[PDB]
Design a protein around this ligand. Structure first.
Ligand SMILES: *[C@@H]1O[C@H](CO)[C@@H](O)[C@H](O)[C@H]1NC(C)=O
Ligand SMILES: *[C@@H]1O[C@H](CO)[C@@H](O)[C@H](O)[C@H]1NC(C)=O
Ligand SMILES: *[C@@H]1O[C@H](CO)[C@@H](O)[C@H](O)[C@H]1NC(C)=O
Ligand SMILES: *[C@@H]1O[C@H](CO)[C@@H](O)[C@H](O)[C@H]1NC(C)=O
Ligand SMILES: *[C@@H]1O[C@H](CO)[C@@H](O)[C@H](O)[C@H]1NC(C)=O
Ligand SMILES: *[C@@H]1O[C@H](CO)[C@@H](O)[C@H](O)[C@H]1NC(C)=O
Lengths: 172, 319, 319, 172, 319, 172
């Protein structure tokens, strides 16, 4: 990936995350938990479906064409017919080979990007109340119960509530 | 300063390898196959209209050879031509065979319009043992074998058919090549024969070629078939001093020709598909297929690759 | 701790929808159309050199039929051939019509070099009522109709033209097909006729075909035209015992052949364009066009899509 | 977009920004203002015109070709001529469809990227003197008059000048 | 608060320009050329099997003209045909020349299977001064010139060859065109002649064409060559009343035909390459080449561009 | 580049960095030094090699084809043969032209990305002990000898060791 999140500072994925593509894993005084993130997951999924719809799209509806199998050689005209078809096939086979390669490279960069967006979203939520540990995890410098954690996950976390506590813990 | 929250992504035990620009093997969580490598063992008779020629190929179908009566009046999107089709009539060839087969196949119907040809003096409805119908000597039922009268006469034929219909007409006719000078005179008196068929802007002239060909169904002679298309506002003139295999009428040509032919031994079934290959119909949505370059209908594009996997998920890094 | 600075981007009230890999409809601020779907109602005579055949197609132009005199000496990048062109001479056909038409069009000029053919005994300059010029019976002015002498003689013709010029020569010649044996003898004494035209390495031999064709301008006979190309250092030999429609010389062939033909009814105007379709010229910078697959000159590539919008701005998210 | 700026943490665009693609919108003691950033705007424009020039580029200069319209069917040779042309058209139409799709996806990612670059530039200018509010806006923790603001926009802002004031406001 | 650590990247003094989507000239540290614009001045005889025709083109090789004996039994992946090849025998043409040339080249070997034809009464092994072998009048050594007996007789010929081998047979045969009626009678008694060669499902009939052609090696006559393919389980029948240039046997056709022909004057050397153009072999790994559209073997794809540089490094920003 | 690192906040490259694509340049009390980073360099190299392998890959192994050179015009069939080959060449020339452009655009974005990843890696190692100067350089707010510098480059740097010293220097 271009952003270096998936297979990057995120060391690995979570096989236990079975209701989402991205999510939260926390540890506080009350315990530990894992919860999927809906917006990030949906964003990745929608863009992958867009590819699927555009790809599995158009007809190629052909009927009367040319002969493509021959019992015996005839010469000039058969040579051209054979050459025309072989030419067609190589070009389209190339198109297919390149297309899938392009889509996949883009698909991986998109998913890697969406991971990074989620981390950055939470980073901005926490302000001066937390520090990046480097492995996609934030050390939270105030007491944060399950209600507090959920407020981060659902985007209602108010950093000003804990800022004094957090700054004091960070720098003393 | 003690609680921690981590951001992460999902993973599975075993993912799927895909290609990118930079890597021939990348493991992603999910992937989707874009190449169709499975076919049905039968041809689907819906929603396209298929016509099984069975023991008759499309050329003998048009000529009306013995065993082809079931093709009368047929209309098709795709004519199904069988590899084990066999000749059941007088030995023949078609100078531009593939072109005639193309026209008949593309036209997409066998609508024959009978016409009365006022031939002069000559006997009509000549038959042959090479073309038996229920143990009786017969011939192509779309063709009319002209021979000399009992009075040993074959006068110059000079007949005209005018087209003031609203459709183009396809006349199929032939020229007979006898094995010997004796057979020539015995059949057509005159020697040599000769045929000239013409429209306002086109013509075909054929001189018979006498000689021994290999024995096929007891005959050393051959018939060479030709065709003439007559547009509305045009007319056709038949001119002969011998050896003409005359038409009994013409086939109707559709203005718009949308049909084709598919040669295969695959049987017609009861499935539904709009894509047919010579290996059988496909029932797939994938954009590509590697089954056969010969494909008719609403089909995936033919490619060489046996497999091409589209990533539908992120990179899989488990644990 | 109170001031605030915000980073942002522009937007408009109503943007343009474009396609990407993942979305068929994305709104961006600005976009540019890449498919040209408009044509001019006329053909531009600049900067390409156009020649209007008018009532003459390129074949009758080459034969020099009545009404084609305006094409004499013409040079073209694109020969403009008209759908309403009509035959004004003796009824003819061309065995390889499209091939001859291609050669003339590709060559790109009508530079005829008259030559004196020392024909023996036979009468020259035969004319016909099917090919009148100002109420006088005439003929193709590039062709020479040979007939029997007043002494009822048509001796074997045996003439040679050697090419030691620095250009390849195009000889156009024909064979006459009489309607009856009477017409055959009345014209050429001998029966049958016959023509053989050959170079050092190539040849064409034609035997006349006597028979009734449809009446066209009062004639049941036909002329079939052929051609022979004679390279520098080569020579051509005409051999005849009847029915030859002889050439009066040859056309010059350019070494490099860069021209072509465009069949259309669209009138030539006063605009400037280097791209011509059968629907009219294009004046555009767009890389694609959906107007016609038939396009000549410096043209956009033909595509099926009526429209393909290239994003030229960011995503539009207004308010 | 891959970076999540446009249609991301920037909630929407500015219809009042009519002289640039990107810019600044501020509020201080003296009032409010909007001004375009020329460098970010130009960077986007150059890359987009670059696409246009490479696209609207090459001739396709063709004359003597083949017949493509036919009165009546002839058979084998006409079938091949018809098949060749239809094959060509589909291939080029595919190329056009894919090309536009590739360019557009890239154009959106570039513009989103250029937005992100501008935000990151300003982020680095401000150092410890400001905080990311989460909406592409920085809270500036010192008095910042119109001359101060312009120094940020034109890149002459010196963080050391206000550092003491800003840190004191941030953490007390 | 004083130490500093900087992150950066490498650069060189002078980099290489490459193209992207948005820029025709971007300087990167390293690049790799993808278009091969250099060729070897020779053809590599390994690992492909090359056969040099030298003074014989592939057509005269098959007929067995003087000077072509070295091609006997030859097997090739690529037949090398020389531009300066010259005719050394009786003047001939091949109505479907390129088609016969294609078949011979594609088949990939000259394996001739000699056969005894029991011709009746007629003299065999006719020779000519136009086809001298060591100052002695000769002929194509694969062909058999039949002429009338000393008793001035040319009876109807009627011979059959049946194929129950496990390979398809290629019969090459011809028809002679005399210059005059005198030459016709002097050679074949009968006038006119005629040839008919036929299988179970196909046939070819030729009537000789008498006339003066240009003098080539002292001859005004011509031989027109034809061919007939006979599948296993089929048979061939030769029928003649004059002018037949008979075969002395047949060539073996491989079931699988994998070979081809390359016309070039470039000499065969000692290098190793699996890619050959008419300009010489290529020894390269690049995916593209601009040397020639004519390329045979394992070759880069031909493109118009003279150069296409693939970036193999980051942007170069020196100092 | 999409990330704006190379030819961006990194003003220029280092001609003295001859044993790597990316690396470290430092200044402390003991002096100055330049050292290559192995992981970043290798990551860039591997992905570029992947392109090379996939590109310089597949055969195009063709023998009996069609005639492509002609002495004199013949008409219809020769026209079709010439048209077929010319059509083929233009499509492949298009494919090549686009391929190289796509690869190069991607190659530049990858390398620019790998540059940014390295900077972000070191940023996360340093935590609250350093500040981004804006030119790809971090001001380190504690004494950092050669052993300290190496611990940063090889990823063993422990921010907690210097945190008290660093915070005090930063904000007083
Ligand atoms: C018969 O031929 C004569 C000329 O030989 C012609 O005038 C007449 O129109 C022809 N009749 C028909 C019915 O074709
Ligand atoms: C198509 O691909 C399958 C594997 O996906 C392979 O087994 C099959 O042989 C292929 N068909 C061919 C090469 O005709
Ligand atoms: C006439 O024919 C004779 C042989 O029949 C030939 O020798 C002579 O060259 C011919 N003359 C011309 C002018 O072609
Ligand atoms: C070309 O596209 C336009 C719309 O852009 C459409 O109206 C027109 O019918 C198209 N021409 C065709 C399909 O021939
Ligand atoms: C000779 O011809 C007769 C009929 O004319 C035929 O029955 C016989 O089979 C022929 N012989 C050969 C050997 O072809
Ligand atoms: C191939 O490209 C080279 C430069 O890369 C050029 O010098 C040469 O003329 C080209 N060959 C052609 C155009 O046939």
């Amino acid at each position: 990936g271009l952003f270096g999140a998936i297979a990057g500072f995120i060391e690995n994925g979570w096989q236990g995350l079975i209701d989402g593509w991205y999510g939260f894993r926390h540890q506080n005084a009350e315990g530990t938990g894992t919860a999927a993130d809906l917006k990030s997951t949906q964003a990745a999924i929608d863009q992958i479906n867009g590819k699927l719809n555009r790809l599995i799209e158009k007809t190629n509806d052909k009927y009367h064409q040319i002969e493509k199998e021959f019992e015996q050689v005839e010469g000039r005209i058969q040579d051209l017919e054979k050459y025309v078809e072989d030419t067609k096939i190589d070009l389209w086979s190339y198109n297919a080979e390149l297309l899938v390669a392009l889509e996949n490279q883009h698909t991986i960069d998109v998913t890697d990007s969406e991971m990074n967006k989620l981390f950055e979203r939470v980073r901005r939520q926490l302000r001066e109340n937390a520090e990046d540990k480097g492995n996609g995890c934030f050390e939270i410098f105030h007491k944060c119960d399950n209600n507090c954690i959920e407020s981060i996950r659902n985007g209602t976390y108010d950093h000003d509530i804990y800022r004094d506590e957090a700054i004091n813990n960070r720098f003393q | 300063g003690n609680p921690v929250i981590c951001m992460g992504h999902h993973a599975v035990a075993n993912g799927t390898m895909v290609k990118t620009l930079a890597d021939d093997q990348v493991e992603v969580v999910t992937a989707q196959e874009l190449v169709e490598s499975q076919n049905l063992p039968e041809l689907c008779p819906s929603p396209l209209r298929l016509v099984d020629g069975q023991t008759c190929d499309i050329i003998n179908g048009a000529l009306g050879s013995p065993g082809c009566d079931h093709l009368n009046g047929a209309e098709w999107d795709v004519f199904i031509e069988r590899p084990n089709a066999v000749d059941t009539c007088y030995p023949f060839d078609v100078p531009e065979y593939q072109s005639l087969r193309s026209i008949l196949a593309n036209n997409g119907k066998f609508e024959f319009i009978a016409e009365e040809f006022q031939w002069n003096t000559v006997k009509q409805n000549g038959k042959s043992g090479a073309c038996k119908r229920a143990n009786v000597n017969d011939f192509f039922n779309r063709l009319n074998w002209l021979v000399k009268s009992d009075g040993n006469a074959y006068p110059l034929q000079n007949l005209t058919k005018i087209n003031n219909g609203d459709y183009a007409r396809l006349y199929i006719w032939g020229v007979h090549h006898p094995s010997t000078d004796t057979e020539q005179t015995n059949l057509y008196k005159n020697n040599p024969g000769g045929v000239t068929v013409s429209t306002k802007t086109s013509q075909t002239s054929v001189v018979p070629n006498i000689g021994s060909r290999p024995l096929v169904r007891g005959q050393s002679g051959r018939v060479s078939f030709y065709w003439t298309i007559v547009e509305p506002g045009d007319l056709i003139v038949f001119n002969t001093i011998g050896n003409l295999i005359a038409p009994r009428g013409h086939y109707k040509l559709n203005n718009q020709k949308k049909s084709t032919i598919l040669n295969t031994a695959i049987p017609i079934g009861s499935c539904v598909s709009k894509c047919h290959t010579d290996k059988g119909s496909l029932s797939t949505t994938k954009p590509f297929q590697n089954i056969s370059r010969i494909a008719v209908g609403d089909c995936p594009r033919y490619v060489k690759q046996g497999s091409l996997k589209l990533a539908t998920g992120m990179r899989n890094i488990p644990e």
